[PDB]
Amino acid sequence: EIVYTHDTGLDYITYSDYELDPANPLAGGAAWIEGAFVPPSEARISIFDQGYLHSDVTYTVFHVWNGNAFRLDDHIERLFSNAESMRIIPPLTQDEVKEIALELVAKTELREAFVSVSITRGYSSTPFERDITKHRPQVYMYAVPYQWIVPFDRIRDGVHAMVAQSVRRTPRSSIDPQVKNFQWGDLIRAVQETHDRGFEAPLLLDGDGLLAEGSGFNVVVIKDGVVRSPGRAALPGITRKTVLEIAESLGHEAILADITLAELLDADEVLGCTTAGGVWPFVSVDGNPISDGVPGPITQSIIRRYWELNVESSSLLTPVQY
Amino acid sequence: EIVYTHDTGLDYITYSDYELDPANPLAGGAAWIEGAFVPPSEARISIFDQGYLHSDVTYTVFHVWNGNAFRLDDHIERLFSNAESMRIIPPLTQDEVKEIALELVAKTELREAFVSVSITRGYSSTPFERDITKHRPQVYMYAVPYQWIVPFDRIRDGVHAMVAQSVRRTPRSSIDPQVKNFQWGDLIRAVQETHDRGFEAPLLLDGDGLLAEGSGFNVVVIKDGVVRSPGRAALPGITRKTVLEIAESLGHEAILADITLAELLDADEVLGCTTAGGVWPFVSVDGNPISDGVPGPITQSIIRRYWELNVESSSLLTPVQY
Numbered sequence: 051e052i053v054y055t056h057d058t059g060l061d062y063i064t065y066s067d068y069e070l071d072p073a074n075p076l077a078g079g080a081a082w083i084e085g086a087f088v089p090p091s092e093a094r095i096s097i098f099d100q101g102y103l104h105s106d107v108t109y110t111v112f113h114v115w116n117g118n119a120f121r122l123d124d125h126i127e128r129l130f131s132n133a134e135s136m137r138i139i140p141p142l143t144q145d146e147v148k149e150i151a152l153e154l155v156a157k158t159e160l161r162e163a164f165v166s167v168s169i170t171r172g173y174s175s176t177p178f179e180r181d182i183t184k185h186r187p188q189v190y191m192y193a194v195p196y197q198w199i200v201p202f203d204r205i206r207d208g209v210h211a212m213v214a215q216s217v218r219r220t221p222r223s224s225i226d227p228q229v230k231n232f233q234w235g236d237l238i239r240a241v242q243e244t245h246d247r248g249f250e251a252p253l254l255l256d257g258d259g260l261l262a263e264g265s266g267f268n269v270v271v272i273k274d275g276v277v278r279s280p281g282r283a284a285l286p287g288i289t290r291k292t293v294l295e296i297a298e299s300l301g302h303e304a305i306l307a308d309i310t311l312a313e314l315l316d317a318d319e320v321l322g323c324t325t326a327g328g329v330w331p332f333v334s335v336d337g338n339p340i341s342d343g344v345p346g347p348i349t350q351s352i353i354r355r356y357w358e359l360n361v362e363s364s365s366l367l368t369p370v371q372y
Numbered sequence: 373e374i375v376y377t378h379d380t381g382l383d384y385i386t387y388s389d390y391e392l393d394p395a396n397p398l399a400g401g402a403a404w405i406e407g408a409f410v411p412p413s414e415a416r417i418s419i420f421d422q423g424y425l426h427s428d429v430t431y432t433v434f435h436v437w438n439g440n441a442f443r444l445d446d447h448i449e450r451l452f453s454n455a456e457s458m459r460i461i462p463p464l465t466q467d468e469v470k471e472i473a474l475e476l477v478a479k480t481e482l483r484e485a486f487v488s489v490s491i492t493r494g495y496s497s498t499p500f501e502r503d504i505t506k507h508r509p510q511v512y513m514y515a516v517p518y519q520w521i522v523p524f525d526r527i528r529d530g531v532h533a534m535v536a537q538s539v540r541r542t543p544r545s546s547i548d549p550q551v552k553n554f555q556w557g558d559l560i561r562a563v564q565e566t567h568d569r570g571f572e573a574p575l576l577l578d579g580d581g582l583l584a585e586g587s588g589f590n591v592v593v594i595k596d597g598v599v600r601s602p603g604r605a606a607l608p609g610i611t612r613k614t615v616l617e618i619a620e621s622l623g624h625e626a627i628l629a630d631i632t633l634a635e636l637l638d639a640d641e642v643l644g645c646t647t648a649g650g651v652w653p654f655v656s657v658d659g660n661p662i663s664d665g666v667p668g669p670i671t672q673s674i675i676r677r678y679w680e681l682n683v684e685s686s687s688l689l690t691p692v693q694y
């Protein structure tokens with residue numbers, strides 16, 4: 051009943067050839083909550099958790115591909131940095147979190163996986179707790195089959211983006227978008243605007259009217275061989291990071307920068323990236339084509355290379371011990 | 373073990389004189405989740421609920437005092453209005469929600485209770501669902517003992533406030549603060565700034581530098597007998613609404629308006645209000661006293677009247693059927 055492979059129609063993206071074990075009750079998906087490994091149907095958290103009642107929680111998502119977790123080190127580092135930005139003291143060490151998460155994946159038997167690790171301020175206290183020692187933070191994880199924000203044919207042919215105008219990306223003076231978080235009020239409004247206006251993906255602007263990010267993904271713009279991505283109102287993504295390293299390795303200048311609306315529209319190429327789906331082209335904005343409306347050459351070589359980095363031996367990869 | 377009453381030291385606030393049934397496992401605390409009435413230790417929601425993973429959820433909190441719910445219809449009306457603002461279609465009617473919530477309180481036996489009702493977009497889908505009919509929203513409730521945002525002595529003596537400078541209330545163009553929500557990034561940052569600077573409660577400003585609201589409460593400013601409260605960056609509180617009704621009853625003009633920092637500091641009186649604690653004075657701001665730094669006559673009149681409205685038979689009350 052669980053779907054854990056596809057035929058992708060892409061040479062450079064291939065799932066692993068294997069069968070889940072029917073006698074394993076965590077096969078195909080599972081969670082780690084409060085010290086126990088559980089099936090998805092049991093993956094529940096206290097309604098009193100502040101991560102629910104005040105979204106007082108940060109998180110990351112890493113993926114596993116062909117049995118190796120991608121940049122797990124970077125992910126857990128960011129997670130802990132983000133927790134610290136919120137004054138949340140993780141109850142586990144980074145190495146303990148890595149060990150538990152890898153074992154969680156191991157128990158699902160999943161070779162291609164989406165793994166969420168969230169850390170909340172816990173359910174033993176309220177925001178009005180004067181005594182910070184009373185807080186009891188929780189780590190909650192789950193691992194499920196790799197999820198694609200964008201379909202395979204759209205990785206190959208491109209997506210039609212829209213610049214949201216009913217909403218702007220929450221400012222850092224209210225909620226820091228460089229700390230990964232569950233407070234998606236603005237991102238969901240943008241998705242809803244996408245539905246209303248008949249487009250496929252929202253790109254948001256910041257309060258200064260400059261390019262920010264999308265709904266769960268960063269945006270990258272290419273112009274005369276120079277590869278740029280918003281530095282400010284944008285999560286420092288690990289896919290983005292990888293994309294800029296790829297660009298540099300291909301001979302292109304690659305930088306975080308402020309990008310105007312005009313520059314977005316005038317781009318030779320535009321692309322999107324996030325852990326849940328990888329990298330894909332954006333071939334139009336607001337119904338206007340980007341160049342000739344087909345995925346650009348530099349975009350295609352970044353995509354192919356990103357998927358090669360998922361499979362080549364390197365320090366980017368941590369193998370799961372099934 | 374459960375604390376459900378207090379000696380308050382205030383003549384106008386008195387808890388009911390009763391004992392819980394020790395043989396009733398829901399006594400003193402319970403939740404309603406997915407059709408089941410449960411004790412607090414079994415009150416859990418799916419971690420895949422978009423109300424956690426994307427804070428895609430609105431709520432309200434109503435209280436029960438001496439066995440009567442206070443302004444229950446305004447609350448559920450507001451909750452359904454807020455849900456509509458988010459395009460969440462409640463899976464129950466307003467009347468069904470009232471019936472369940474009152475039954476929940478009955479089973480707890482609490483005569484003085486805090487009751488949360490939240491509605492999420494549910495766990496059967498993600499924000500990347502093209503087909504919006506596949507969303508299955510969830511209503512989650514809990515009822516626990518009445519919760520006081522400020523201690524009794526500070527209702528009497530007044531609270532020392534602080535205008536936050538490290539943070540602004542989230543703009544309406546990102547997350548609408550007139551829709552009650554769990555996305556407290558900014559509110560919590562304002563509270564943390566309160567710890568850092570050594571004050572008791574935060575008041576935020578909006579992006580225009582005008583008075584917004586507090587972390588879980590509305591602010592009201594009184595000057596030459598005129599009672600004003602921020603109209604824009606502030607939740608339309610049912611407590612606020614009651615305060616202005618009371619204010620009109622006493623002969624004062626009472627309005628929603630834009631309030632400056634300078635007006636805040638020059639006020640004759642300032643107070644705070646919310647469901648979880650009632651009404652209370654703010655006797656200083658950033659260390660500067662408001663007037664003579666003791667609670668003012670109008671505020672004291674409001675507070676006393678609010679507590680009479682919690683007790684006198686009127687259309688504002690709905691009895692719990694114990």
Ligand SMILES: *Cc1c(COP(=O)(O)O)cnc(C)c1O
Pocket residue numbers: 111230231263264265266267268284285286287288289290323324325326
């Ligand atoms: C997950 C996410 C990204 C991408 O981060 P990766 O580390 O590449 O997964 C970008 N923006 C937002 C808002 C996100 O939630």
Ligand SMILES: *Cc1c(COP(=O)(O)O)cnc(C)c1O
Pocket residue numbers: 433552553585586587588589590606607608609610611612645646647648
């Ligand atoms: C709950 C709340 C209030 C007060 O609303 P009531 O209807 O009086 O409870 C004010 N501001 C915020 C941000 C809130 O969450």
